[PDB]
Scaffold this active site. Structure first.
Site, PDB file in Angstrom:
ATOM      1  CG  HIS A  82      -2.055   1.197   0.879  1.00 54.57           C
ATOM      2  ND1 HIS A  82      -2.610   1.477  -0.355  1.00 54.57           N
ATOM      3  CD2 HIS A  82      -2.577   2.105   1.737  1.00 54.57           C
ATOM      4  CE1 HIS A  82      -3.435   2.504  -0.242  1.00 54.57           C
ATOM      5  NE2 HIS A  82      -3.441   2.899   1.019  1.00 54.57           N
ATOM      6  NE  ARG A 100      -3.412  -1.764  -8.460  1.00 53.66           N
ATOM      7  CZ  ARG A 100      -2.383  -0.939  -8.506  1.00 53.66           C
ATOM      8  NH1 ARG A 100      -1.838  -0.460  -7.389  1.00 53.66           N
ATOM      9  NH2 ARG A 100      -1.874  -0.533  -9.671  1.00 53.66           N
ATOM     10  CB  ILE A 155       8.670   1.723   5.482  1.00 51.06           C
ATOM     11  CG1 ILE A 155       9.327   1.367   4.140  1.00 51.06           C
ATOM     12  CG2 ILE A 155       9.684   2.395   6.427  1.00 51.06           C
ATOM     13  CD1 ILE A 155      10.470   0.340   4.228  1.00 51.06           C
ATOM     14  CB  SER A 156       4.525   2.863   8.330  1.00 46.27           C
ATOM     15  OG  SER A 156       3.642   2.366   7.329  1.00 46.27           O
ATOM     16  N   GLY A 201       1.478   0.969  10.828  1.00 39.95           N
ATOM     17  CA  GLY A 201       0.250   1.659  11.196  1.00 39.95           C
ATOM     18  C   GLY A 201      -0.987   0.806  11.065  1.00 39.95           C
ATOM     19  CG  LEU A 202      -4.490   2.778  12.268  1.00 41.34           C
ATOM     20  CD1 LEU A 202      -5.602   3.864  12.209  1.00 41.34           C
ATOM     21  CD2 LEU A 202      -4.556   1.973  13.550  1.00 41.34           C
ATOM     22  CG  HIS A 203      -2.699   0.750   5.597  1.00 44.04           C
ATOM     23  ND1 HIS A 203      -2.301   2.032   5.911  1.00 44.04           N
ATOM     24  CD2 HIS A 203      -3.512   0.862   4.523  1.00 44.04           C
ATOM     25  CE1 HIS A 203      -2.855   2.883   5.065  1.00 44.04           C
ATOM     26  NE2 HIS A 203      -3.600   2.198   4.217  1.00 44.04           N
TER      27      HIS A 203
END
EC number: 4.99.1.3
Length: 125
Positions: A10, A46, A69-70, A72-74
């Site tokens: 993403h 997607r 890389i992060s 987070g919430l994804h």
């Protein structure tokens, strides 16, 4: 035990993003490391989403790797929610529609990412 890998991305509007994702899929498929390798996408519209990808896969165990890389919430909510897994950080084991599925941690903090940054300078290869 037939082993599957789904690579989940993403940042997906950016030029050549899917193409780079496909290069990793191709490299890993050619290496024979997994029986089947697919790419999939978090968030809205997607294709395929990780659930479609897993349904289509003819494996006994599928590993889901977030190419983030992060963290987070994804990763802690969206992705687990989609597959009906516990929310939060970390490795998660379970089943998705009868099939064994492991959600792996995002690649972000991996020492290989540190080394990919070094290699952009070093260009050893």
């Amino acid at each position: 035990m037939r082993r599957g890998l789904v690579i989940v991305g993403h940042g997906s509007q950016l030029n050549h993003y899917r193409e780079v994702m496909e290069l990793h899929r191709k490299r890993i498929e050619e290496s024979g490391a997994f029986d089947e390798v697919k790419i999939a996408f978090a968030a809205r519209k997607r294709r395929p989403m990780p659930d479609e990808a897993i349904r289509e896969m003819n494996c006994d165990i599928i590993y889901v790797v977030p190419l983030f890389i992060s963290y987070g919430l994804h990763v802690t909510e969206d992705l687990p929610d989609l597959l009906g897994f516990p929310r939060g950080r970390g490795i998660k084991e379970g089943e998705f529609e009868g099939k064994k599925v492991v959600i792996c941690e995002p690649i972000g903090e991996d020492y290989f990412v540190t080394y990919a940054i070094l290699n952009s300078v070093f260009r050893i290869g």
